[PDB]
Design a protein around this ligand. Structure first.
Ligand SMILES: C[C@H](CCCC(C)(C)O)[C@H]1CC[C@H]2[C@@H]3CC=C4C[C@@H](O)CC[C@]4(C)[C@H]3CC[C@]12C
Ligand SMILES: C[C@H](CCCC(C)(C)O)[C@H]1CC[C@H]2[C@@H]3CC=C4C[C@@H](O)CC[C@]4(C)[C@H]3CC[C@]12C
Lengths: 132, 132
């Protein structure tokens, strides 16, 4: 459930993240810094809202949301999105809608690491986080 | 200036580092790996900010800052600090405040190598890096 994700996470390995950023329309410059930064992601619960804080040399983002409840989200690449995060069994599913398009992120706990799979259409990235 | 530091550096020699870590209050387990790992430090000047990335077998850190502007730093040994990094002549001074204490790092270019002097009270450590 949400408890398994409540911790401080550090990016260790990223797979195909560059092509995924290109499919989203991310420009060359921030793709550079996107391919080098290893963000710290802090997931906690304030009441029943879930809070996700990202710390990075590029930008620092913080979002709060309630499971199943749509919320506005301005992403780090400046996409104005209607987002909703829900529980899919043991995984958190994050759906972002912007300009008539859709991408999603699935967060998992696998062998004690956090695994996030990023999918936009036919482009998939997988990111791996160890608990700090 | 800052540009003299903008390169990839690799630690080659460390003088009095173990005694400095003890004085700093670093736990034994973290000290033990601190005396073995030879980190890679990448310094860059990006926009109006300076970026310092550190790669090692212990952990990877990254900070971004403008000179003279105080910022939150979580050090590799888990100190939550109020830090400020500024130019001191041709040197970079890095100050860390936590728990009513303070330590400071003086970075300099000497004979083509980056020399870092670490002070905590009357305990001093010197770390030497060669440019990769
Ligand atoms: C490319 C832009 C932002 C710039 C990237 C970055 C990583 C430096 O923050 C968007 C597209 C998808 C978004 C990311 C999803 C993966 C994560 C989780 C975690 O490591 C912290 C943030 C990050 C990289 C999101 C940041 C915004 C991203 C990269
Ligand atoms: C000792 C702890 C962290 C544990 C050290 C290590 C090497 C295990 O990361 C603190 C106190 C002094 C701090 C460092 C200043 C020297 C450098 C430069 C470069 O070699 C890598 C990072 C580091 C070691 C600073 C951050 C943490 C240090 C070592």
């Amino acid at each position: 459930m949400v408890e398994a994700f409540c911790a401080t996470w550090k990016l260790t390995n990223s797979q195909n993240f560059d092509e995924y950023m290109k499919a989203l329309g991310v420009g060359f410059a921030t793709r550079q810094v996107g391919n080098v930064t290893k963000p710290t992601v802090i997931i906690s619960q304030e009441g029943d809202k879930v809070v996700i804080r990202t710390l990075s040399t590029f930008k620092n983002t913080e979002i709060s949301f309630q499971l199943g409840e749509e919320f506005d989200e301005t992403t780090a690449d400046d996409r104005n999105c209607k987002s909703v995060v829900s529980l899919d069994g043991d995984k958190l599913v994050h759906i972002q809608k912007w300009d008539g398009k859709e991408t999603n992120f699935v967060r998992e706990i696998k062998d004690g690491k956090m695994v996030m799979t990023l999918t936009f259409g036919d482009v998939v990235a997988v990111r791996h986080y160890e608990k700090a």
